[PDB]
Amino acid sequence: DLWQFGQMILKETGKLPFPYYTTYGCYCGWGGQGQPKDATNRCCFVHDCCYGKLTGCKPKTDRYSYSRENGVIICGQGTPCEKQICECDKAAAVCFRENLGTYKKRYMAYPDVLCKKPAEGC
Ligand SMILES: CCCCCCCCCCCCCCCCCC(=O)O
Ligand code: NA
User: Fold this and answer.
1) To 5 degrees, how large is the angle CA 73–CA 76–CA 79?
2) DSSP 19-55
3) How big is the chain by its Cα radius of gyration, in Å?
4) Ligand 1 atom closest to the CA of 29, numbered from 1
5) Whole-number Å distance between alpha carbons of 12 and 73
6) Residues 6 or more apart from 4 whose CB is under 8 A from it?
């Protein structure tokens, strides 16, 4: 669920998920518009697409099992929805960590007027 995704983000990046990954670029936030502005933004875009594939699941409310061992997130046993949601969340959290080097404070609260057409497609 979103509480768990938030904890993953904090564990992987050392940043609180709000505001650092809720108001960044064009896609780190609710949905998005336009094209991803950098690597971190593309992680958010991919995560949105990942959730999009889970048509029969409720990714923001379904709580799943996971652990984090030798610095690796391990999605635990569960329903197919729980497992797939966990894997979407893990991938995005790791993606954020891997692109912290290019995280730009400039892109927090990125003006929605610059998230211009054409939209990137999943
Ligand atoms: C007045 C309201 C203040 C704002 C609300 C504060 C509470 C926010 C709780 C955050 C929990 C985890 C949020 C997960 C964010 C996911 C980001 C993303 O889509 O990449
Ligand atoms: Na988004």
Assistant:
1) 135
2) HHTTSBTTTBSSS--S---SHHHHHHHHHHHHHHT-T
3) 14
4) 19
5) 9
6) 63, 64, 66, 86, 89
Is 112 noted as a catalytic residue in this protein? no
How many other β-carbons are positioned within 10 Å of the β-carbon of residue 86? 24
Residues 26 and 68: their CA atoms lie apart, in Å, by: 29
47 is catalytic: yes
Residue with the smallest CA separation from ligand 1 atom 8 is 18
**Which member of 1, 47, 48, 112 is catalytic?**
47
- CA–CA gap between residue 91 and residue 66 (Å, rounded): 13
What single letter denotes the amino acid at residue 115? Answer: C
Count the helices and strands in the chain (H runs, E runs): 4, 2
